[PDB]
């Protein structure tokens, strides 16, 4: 049996609500500042919640009426049945995955966990002291090696065309004291390559599962407060498959041989590694 890194949609919310504020939306207003995910699709605001929850920062929304706020059934969106000249199906799926990405980001930023900047995404980690006894589901998640503190991480980005699922890309973040991150990204990459041989796939799965269970709030899902009334449930259980044929498990010696093969990849290639070792001291 194998379990993947995917996390499907338990129950997709019914209503996709478009808010045609038109002249009620300031031009200089930043769309990212909203507590709910939204986009300025033409003169509409493609949202997931009601119209009257943005009155805290937008003092013009209260003049907007309900019946111009159109709704779209997401069953036809996921099935491809949705056929309207306003939005076609595929870019609707694209805006949907954009919305759920932003919603997950804001929900998990609301739980007060730290953040590290990647190139085209973001990876996240639990700071020291927040998790008691440094254990979660009998799995180590954030530890200490040599003198640098390593923090396990994830990176999520959805895609729905085979099924409404969400992937997670496992990362690991490093720091020297558990307070501030490493100044140089190359040192982080070096520590990642150093710690790669320290553990192996089973520990990767354990850390990933511990992270998923830690970011969850309920038992068999996570709670995405996409709207004030409507939430999104993510199957925290990873998607599991199986193969008809497989191998026979060997002893632990071949794990050491895999670490040896990591050292073979160390020997076979090298590219300006000498400066970062000689000039670091």
């Amino acid at each position: 049996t194998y379990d993947s890194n995917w996390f499907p949609i338990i129950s997709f919310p019914n209503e996709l609500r478009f808010h045609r504020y038109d002249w009620r939306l300031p031009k200089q207003f930043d769309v990212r500042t909203l507590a709910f995910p939204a986009i300025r699709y033409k003169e509409y605001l493609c949202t997931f919640a009601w119209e009257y929850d943005f009155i805290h920062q937008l003092p013009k929304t209260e003049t907007y009426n309900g019946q111009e706020s159109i709704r779209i059934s997401t069953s036809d969106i996921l099935s491809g049945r949705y056929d309207t000249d306003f939005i076609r199906n595929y870019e609707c799926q694209r805006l949907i995955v954009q919305l759920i990405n932003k919603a997950f980001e804001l929900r998990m930023k609301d739980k007060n966990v730290r953040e590290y900047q990647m190139s085209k995404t973001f990876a996240y980690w639990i700071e020291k002291g927040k998790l008691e006894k440094d254990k979660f589901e009998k799995i180590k998640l954030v530890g200490k090696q040599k003198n640098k503190y390593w923090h396990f991480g994830i990176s999520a980005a959805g895609k729905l065309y085979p099924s409404p699922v969400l992937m997670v890309s496992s990362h690991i973040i490093f720091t020297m004291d558990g307070i501030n991150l490493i100044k140089s990204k190359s040192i982080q990459h070096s520590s990642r390559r150093k710690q790669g041989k320290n553990w192996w796939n089973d520990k990767w799965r354990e850390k990933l599962l511990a992270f998923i269970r830690f970011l969850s709030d309920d038992q068999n899902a996570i709670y995405l407060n996409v709207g004030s009334e409507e939430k999104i449930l993510i199957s925290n259980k990873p998607l599991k498959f199986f193969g008809k044929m497989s191998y026979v498990t060997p002893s632990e010696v071949t794990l050491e041989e895999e670490s040896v093969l990591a050292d073979i990849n160390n020997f076979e290639e090298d590219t300006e590694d000498l400066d970062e070792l000689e000039d670091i001291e």
Binding site: S4, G243, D270
Partner: protein, 465 residues
Amino acid sequence: MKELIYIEEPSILFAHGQKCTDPRDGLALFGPLNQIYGIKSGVVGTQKGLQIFKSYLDKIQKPIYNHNNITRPMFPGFEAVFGCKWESQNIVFKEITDEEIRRYLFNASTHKRTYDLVTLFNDKIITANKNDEERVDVWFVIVPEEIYKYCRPNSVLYNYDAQFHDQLKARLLEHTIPTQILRESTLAWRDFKNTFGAPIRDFSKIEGHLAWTISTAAYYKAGGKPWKLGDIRPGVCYLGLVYKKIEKSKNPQNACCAAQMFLDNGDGTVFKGEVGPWYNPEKGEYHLKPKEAKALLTQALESYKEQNKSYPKEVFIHARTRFNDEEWNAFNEVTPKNTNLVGVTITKSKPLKLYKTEGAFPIMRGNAYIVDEKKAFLWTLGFVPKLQSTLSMEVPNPIFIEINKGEAEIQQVLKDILALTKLNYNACIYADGEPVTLRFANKIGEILTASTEIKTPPLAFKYYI
């Protein structure tokens, strides 16, 4: 809830008309299909390079073993595994003086340092091949530690690439001279010492594997085919298209697409693409103008006609990005009506890590995943029972195939890809992540897009890796 259909490992044909999965073990068992009678090695370097190359080849004359040879199999000796002889005698050497090296090195500009070194090496190879009454089939230049560490572009104390061997091969294309590049750190790990003491290229436990790789590369560059493929249906051509990006300064470089063609033999009948200033990188989706499309298709068709004396009943096209429809409309206008066009896009960046629920080893290589009838996930990476270890680190990642247009069985393209991904020649390994026509794609694009002076290169493959 959904199954992972497995594809059997295609066996490579060996000597005496027999087949085995692992190339190293079976090659030690049977040997090459067509033996050569031996080749002369021309080493170009210093006296230190001479003695270290002679010592290394004398070391690989005798049989040597790895730490555990289920994973990295035995090296019984070059004569004991290939048949063709190799000795320290009758080896031609060309003097590389320090005076030229020092006079070139004292210049501050690293790019012109690379320029003058490649000019010196090419000129010495030319004056070794144009007047010497002897004959050399394979050349083995040696680069010391200081040259490699000082020729780095960003080492701090325009028509050519900064790296060495790419433009050495590119300027050596026209004279049809095969050669191999060997770092000093590669074959001299015994005396290559860092600050700590350990060898940087720590080839100590796998000197058998190093001998395997070097000997297989030499036998490939000699002229004798190491292995072929087992099952090939008549009338199929694997055209793995390259789209390596070219950055030749400020001129419009655009697209420099190339291809490797597999019709009935393991070697790729590679035809060079155009310098090709079309399709402005604003539309950098790497499509094909129709006229170059029919040019490439006709090149492949007449290559098949000249090497098989028939018409190809099916065409395979491999790439990394997706395909349009106008290029296939231009394609089908020149194809015979009995042909079939298949365009398969291969990606790696898709995140999908099938973790193991319980056990001590991850998902094996070859367990494919089917999504639709046109696209699928194939695991060419991971565990294999023959080698009894994984080829990856942590958790492997699969490749995602996708038939863009054209109707085909997904199992057929899956088996074709799995058969294609087991012909890595420069590295003697059981299997790699990417297929061979894509693994060699970066190399062939780098070579063919390093010197603009090449117009019609040699279409044999031995002058590239």
